Amino acid sequence: GCVLGLVNSSLFVEDGQSLCALPDTPSMRLAS
Amino acid sequence: IFNLTLLEPARSAIEDLLFDKVTIADPGYMQGY
Numbered sequence: 001g002c003v004l005g006l007v008n009s010s011l012f013v014e015d016g017q018s019l020c021a022l023p024d025t026p027s028m029r030l031a032s
Numbered sequence: 033i034f035n036l037t038l039l040e041p042a043r044s045a046i047e048d049l050l051f052d053k054v055t056i057a058d059p060g061y062m063q064g065y
Contacts (some may be wrong), residue, residue, distance in 0.1 A: 004061060 003031050 002008025004020035009030045016024035016032070024032035038046045 023035070 001030070 001009065003023055007030060009028050011029045012031060014026075014032050016022070016026075018029055019025040021028050024027050026032060027031075038044055040051075042048075
């Protein structure tokens with residue numbers, strides 16, 4: 001993670017719950 | 033895709049005007065700390 005700050009997940013871009021902002025984070029598996 | 037100040041010559045050109053004029057310091061994110 002570094003989109004807002006290091007996040008303890010293990011998936012970069014997989015193209016919402018708004019974990020940071022646009023990141024959808026559908027499940028882990030964040031930044032969509 | 034007359035005078036178009038609103039149209040971008042990042043973001044709208046007018047948006048940048050207004051955001052700059054008013055005092056900011058609001059976005060302390062990622063490197064803000």
